[PDB]
Design a protein around this ligand. Structure first.
Ligand SMILES: CC(C)(O)CNC(=O)c1ccncc1NC(=O)c1nc(C2CC2)ccc1Nc1cncnc1
Ligand SMILES: [Mg+2]
Ligand SMILES: [Zn+2]
Length: 313
């Protein structure tokens, strides 16, 4: 109980910043995660023995894909930490526990292929889950690992708190389906601009947690340029493999996913920053003002891609 996790000084300072990069040392990530739970939630939230075996079983069920991997899970969880640490008073005790675990688990057992390709491939998971195919699967893996012996990190919760948190996690994980993001933001946009946003209305919280989950999931666009630049290489590696698999089904893939169309990437990034990222982090800064850095970082990276197009790199 009186065992605290501590980090080297540079990490200890930088980890409180939105643009922290978790680093290339795999074996440091679990201690980084547990140090954030401890500071975001409390030392007493989770039995440390049960928490560690949950973290290690989650790590095990992430695959060796270029992007949707163990480092993405921990990277996204840290972005949720930064948001919770800069909005101290706005969240209950169950939301702080549920959301840090939701993010670590959000891409559990990703194969490196979108819901589109599962549907076109006719993968069994597309028969079982007709919308948010991957995302409902991710939740199912999270509940599986929660029910392995020695893995029930929530064992001290009541029947009803247990059900409240798994419900937080389910909605939290479903929201990471970007197809749901566009509508969800446009409803928060309106609500905020008519001034009907009510953080005591449970259906309004759900929407806001949803807008956070999108923000945290895309947070590699909100890092320093050399980190965002090199993370783009990893995300496109996945897109291009899926493009190749699309061609194998006899379907010309969209340009994003065609590796013969890498010339279009800088322009493709612009549309993404304009169509998705800048709006996500705009509406989040309107709802949670202390999250403004994520917008600024996003804007800086948009400006770096314009400099790639203008042949300045
Ligand atoms: C609506 C639609 C087509 O589904 C969304 N459209 C695109 O995703 C889209 C379109 C064109 N070109 C790239 C696209 N997508 C991305 O670039 C991207 N996507 C994701 C999540 C799967 C989505 C996360 C990060 C991303 N970029 C990035 C990541 N890390 C560092 N730098 C940049
Ligand atoms: Mg996902
Ligand atoms: Zn993700």
């Amino acid at each position: 109980g009186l065992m605290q996790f501590t980090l080297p000084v540079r990490l200890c300072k930088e980890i409180e910043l939105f643009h922290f990069d978790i680093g290339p040392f795999e074996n440091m990530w679990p201690g980084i995660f547990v140090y954030m739970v401890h500071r975001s939630c409390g030392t007493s939230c989770f039995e440390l023995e049960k928490l560690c075996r949950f973290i290690m079983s989650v790590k095990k069920n992430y695959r060796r894909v270029p992007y949707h991997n163990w480092k993405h899970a921990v990277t996204v969880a840290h972005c949720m930490y930064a948001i919770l640490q800069n909005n101290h008073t706005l969240f209950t005790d169950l939301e702080r526990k549920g959301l840090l675990i939701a993010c670590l688990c959000h891409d559990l057992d990703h194969r490196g292929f979108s819901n589109s390709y599962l549907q076109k491939f006719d993968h069994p998971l597309a028969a079982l889950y007709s919308t948010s195919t991957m995302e409902q699967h991710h939740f199912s893996q999270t509940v599986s690992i929660l029910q392995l012996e020695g893995h029930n990190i929530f064992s001290t919760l009541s029947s009803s708190e247990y059900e409240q948190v798994l419900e937080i996690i389910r909605k939290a994980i479903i929201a990471t389906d970007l197809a749901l993001y566009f509508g969800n933001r446009k409803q928060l946009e309106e609500m905020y601009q008519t001034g009907s946003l009510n953080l005591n209305n449970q259906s309004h919280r759900d929407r806001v947690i949803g807008l956070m989950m999108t923000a945290c999931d895309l947070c590699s666009v909100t890092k320093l340029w050399p980190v965002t630049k090199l993370t783009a290489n990893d995300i496109y590696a996945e897109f291009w493999a899926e493009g190749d698999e699309m061609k194998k089904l006899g379907i010309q893939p969209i340009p994003m996913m065609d590796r013969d169309k890498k010339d279009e990437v800088p322009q493709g990034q612009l549309g993404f920053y304009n169509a998705v990222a800048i709006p996500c982090y705009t509406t989040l800064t309107q709802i949670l003002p202390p999250t403004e850095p994520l917008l600024k970082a996003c804007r800086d990276n948009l400006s770096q891609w314009e400099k790639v197009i203008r042949g300045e790199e």
